[PDB]
Design a protein around this ligand. Structure first.
Ligand SMILES: [Fe+2]
Length: 676
């Protein structure tokens, strides 16, 4: 891989490993020293190949002094061949070894100028050569990465209509690297359900019929779901350890909108206490989908009426400390045509009620828990980072690894998936505009506190490990959150002497302020910091960014196929309205209410595709791109990895004793960033 060119400085250039990293164009390189610049030297003449490391002997016509910058220029040879430059190092005449991190695509469009890898705050740069580069870099970043309102009331996002319009730096490594159109269809072929992709009018004949298709493609967990999805235990299990375990909260008093009585649920209670007394003991929990109330159902297919509920599900921590459903009201306003279903009802009344709650859980999962609260939020942090933090800034170096491909995957999504007439309209009952309504309404109550994991759990009354023992999403989440809190606190303490340095960092303040004003639209009730004025506050802020982008997203993303592939346990749509009376529903009707073959197929394709890890996935703590090069921060990273390794073992041992292991938050399965 290593090609040395001998005719001074020794200039090493490392090309990227990506498919199209190589270039065959001319590469000129000059050195900017305190005592003066150098000449523009052409390099190689040949080709810089994928994975290559080329070094050169470069003799200069005058003494340059200490090297401050390195300029790179790509002039065309034949056609335009993009070039991914990982980094450049120098062995100077005086024997110094200097590394210049890059990790950028170099299209001929403009000269690329690099700092040496030591992270510097603005206050560290007092000479004109550095200050000018720093200021000019931010000017360029702010012309290149702009905010834009994609839909009314959304967090602001990148100013680009489609993926190819993005700056090359933040695009996927290929144009079809991660593609919703391509990956969904390929998914459907590998699941052998390709023939169903347009059967939007054909119901399954029965559960045996869908099951015929499903046994061929089930995995460990979804097969468990196939065999146990009708059980109250599995139903309640998912609110804690399923694909979307963030909605349930301890009920401190029954809502007036749910007129449920002790008599109605006496058969479920097991401590000889009334329902009301049970609530006061802290044994009653609730999942309430008031958000779905008023959301427009998908009408893009005039031949299929699709339907949404907005249920209130009451649950109960029984004597075995398992949480189970004891009552379900499918809509918000109590009444005669809005029955409170119970486990003591006819078999299929209770089953269908649970199916509607599972379907509602799915809608809120897709759009709010997943899209808004990890994807869109992570893009807000990413854009603000690019706009306000130069590459030499320690916080840029820290965060860039954790917003990798985030803007790219989100732009792909707005281009193909969630736009008008996107893939999302095919199977989802909220498709066609409802999902946009959900984001707008959830946005009004998206807060900074709700992204702080420990507080969020506490706010939902689910913090007690003693009272609520089997909340594995909570337990593991807390371990990983604390591991990140530890790592960010350490990095902050290295580069910030005190709280006053944090407060006076104008680029940090502008980063935080962009997130607040543009990202979060300047809504006062968002609770986001307008500024950050202590190392402790900065540490927490950075943990919010990193945790949301890695752990939180992993928790709510990679369990989609496990739990949703068996469709009756996560219907993306319902083709009949919720039952208004008891004693009417039949199993045949349920099969016709569940999604047809066409929507089942697009649903399966989607949840499989989104749950895949890429071959060379970068998991939490893996930083192959060395933006940081200093010993102290490198050791902080090493401690981060060891701390994470310990968590992997804690979680593994914990899982050996579980009927159904929970591993979405095992750090070795948590990607660095939102990339799918
Ligand atoms: Fe995702």
């Amino acid at each position: 891989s290593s090609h040395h060119h001998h005719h001074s400085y020794t200039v090493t250039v490392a090309t990227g490993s990506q498919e199209h990293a190589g270039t065959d164009d001319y590469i000129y390189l000059s050195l900017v020293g305190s005592a003066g610049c150098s000449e523009k030297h052409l390099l190689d003449k040949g080709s810089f190949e994928r994975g290559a490391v080329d070094s050169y002997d470069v003799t200069v016509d005058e003494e340059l002094g200490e090297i401050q910058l390195v300029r790179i220029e790509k002039r065309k040879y034949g056609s335009n061949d993009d070039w991914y430059l990982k980094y450049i190092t120098l062995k100077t005449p005086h024997g110094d070894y200097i590394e210049f991190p890059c990790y950028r695509w170099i299209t001929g469009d403009v000269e690329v100028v690099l700092r040496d890898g030591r992270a510097k705050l603005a206050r560290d740069d007092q000479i004109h050569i550095l200050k000018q580069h720093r200021r000019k870099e931010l000017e360029t970043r702010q012309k290149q990465y702009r905010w834009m309102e994609w839909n009314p009331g959304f967090p602001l996002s990148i100013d680009a209509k489609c993926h190819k319009d993005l700056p090359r730096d933040i695009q996927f490594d290929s144009e079809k690297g991660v593609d919703f159109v391509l990956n969904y269809s390929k998914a459907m072929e590998n699941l052998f359900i390709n023939r169903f992709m347009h059967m939007f009018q054909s119901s399954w004949n029965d559960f045996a019929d869908f099951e015929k298709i499903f046994v061929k493609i089930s995995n460990t967990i979804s097969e468990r779901v196939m065999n146990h999805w009708q059980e109250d235990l599995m139903f309640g299990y998912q609110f804690l350890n399923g694909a979307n375990p963030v909605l349930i909260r301890r009920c401190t008093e029954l809502p007036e909108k749910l007129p449920v009585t002790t008599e109605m649920v006496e058969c479920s209670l097991e401590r000889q206490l009334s329902l009301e007394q049970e609530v006061q003991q802290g044994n009653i929990f609730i999942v309430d989908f008031e958000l779905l109330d008023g959301i427009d159902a998908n009408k893009t297919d005039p031949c299929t009426l699709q339907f949404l509920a907005a249920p209130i599900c009451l649950l109960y921590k029984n004597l075995a400390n398992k949480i189970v459903p004891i009552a379900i009201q499918l809509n918000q306003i109590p009444g005669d045509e809005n029955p409170i279903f119970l486990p003591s009802d006819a078999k299929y009344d209770w089953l269908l009620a649970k199916i509607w709650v599972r379907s509602s859980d799915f809608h809120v999962h897709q759009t709010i828990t997943h899209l808004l609260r990890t994807h869109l939020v992570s893009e807000v942090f990413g854009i603000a980072m690019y706009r306000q933090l130069p590459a030499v800034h320690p916080i840029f170096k820290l965060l860039v690894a954790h917003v990798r491909f985030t803007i790219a995957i989100n732009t792909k999504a707005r281009e193909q998936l969630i736009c008008e007439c996107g893939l999302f309209d095919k199977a989802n009952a909220t498709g066609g505009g409802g999902h946009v309504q959900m984001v707008q309404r959830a946005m009004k109550d998206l807060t900074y506190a709700s992204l702080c994991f420990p507080e969020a759990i506490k706010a939902r009354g689910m913090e007690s490990k003693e009272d609520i023992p089997y909340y594995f999403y909570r337990d593991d989440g807390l371990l990983v959150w604390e591991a990140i809190r530890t790592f960010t606190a350490e990095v902050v303490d290295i580069y910030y002497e005190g709280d006053q340095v944090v407060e006076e960092d104008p680029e940090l303040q502008d980063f935080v302020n962009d997130v607040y004003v543009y990202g979060m639209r300047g809504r006062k009730s968002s609770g986001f910091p307008k500024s950050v004025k202590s190392r402790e506050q900065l540490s927490e802020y950075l943990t919010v960014v990193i945790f949301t982008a890695s752990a939180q997203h992993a928790a709510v993303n990679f369990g989609q196929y496990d739990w949703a592939s068996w469709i009756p346990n996560a219907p993306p749509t319902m083709r009949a309205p919720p039952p208004t009376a008891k004693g009417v529903v039949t199993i045949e009707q349920i099969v016709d209410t569940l999604p047809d073959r066409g929507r089942s197929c697009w649903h399966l394709g989607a949840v499989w595709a989104l749950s895949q890890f890429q071959e060379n996935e970068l998991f939490l703590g893996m930083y192959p791109e060395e933006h940081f090069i200093e010993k102290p921060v490198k050791e902080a990273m090493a401690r981060f990895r060891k701390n994470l390794e310990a968590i992997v073992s804690v979680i593994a041992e914990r899982n050996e004793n579980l009927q159904l292991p929970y591993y979405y938050l095992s750090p070795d399965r948590i990607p660095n960033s939102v990339a799918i």
